[PDB]
Amino acid sequence: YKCEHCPQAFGDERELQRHLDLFQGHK
Numbered sequence: 001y002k003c004e005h006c007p008q009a010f011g012d013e014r015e016l017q018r019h020l021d022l023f024q025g026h027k
């Protein structure tokens with residue numbers, strides 16, 4: 001939906017999911 005952090009705001013939870021996935025992707 002809306003991300004306060006990195007200026008991101010999409011109406012698709014996949015986007016955030018990708019953010020968390022990629023962000024959490026790194027050790």
Ligand SMILES: [Zn+2]
Pocket residue numbers: 003004005006007008019
């Ligand atoms: Zn963010």
